[PDB]
Homo-oligomer: A and B are copies of this chain.
Amino acid sequence: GSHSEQLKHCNGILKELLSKKHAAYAWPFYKPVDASALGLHDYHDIIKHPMDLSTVKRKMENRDYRDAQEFAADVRLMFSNCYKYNPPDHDVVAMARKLQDVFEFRYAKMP
């Protein structure tokens, strides 16, 4: 129920999402989506603001998050990016869901 200890909580969420525990679904989000390499046609038109956990990690370490709601919007932006671009039956879409399940729960248990 404070900023400095809430941001601590979000750091906690970040570490969990990046831990070896969640590696088998989390791995597409470790780094910025490489649209060229993966052949994602029009990825940069369809997707206004890219976001991944490495970006989130950086703003966290440089202390660029002013509050928790902001952390949240970036994390959800990252998943929404995935859901927007991809067909519902896409493998990565299932993976976004499983990681987001982890996100939403620990985020709900915030002070």
Number of this chain's copies in the complex = 2
**Are B104 and A83 interface neighbours, CB within 8 A?**
yes
Interface check A55, CB cutoff 8 A: no
CA distance A64 to B92 in the complex (A): 35
Interface check A39, CB cutoff 8 A: no
Nearest CB to that of A108 among chain B residues? B83
Nearest CB to that of A81 among chain B residues? B108
- How many A residues have CB within 8 A of the partner chain? 17
Contact flags A39-76 to B (C-beta < 8 A → 1, else 0): 00000000000000000000000000000000000001
A sample of 13 inter-chain contacts (CB < 8 A) reads A76-B104, A80-B108, A81-B108, A82-B108, A83-B104, A83-B107, A84-B108, A84-B109, A88-B105, A93-B105, A97-B101, A97-B104, A100-B104
Chain A interface residues (CB < 8 Å from chain B): 76, 79-84, 88, 93, 97, 100-101, 104-105, 107-109
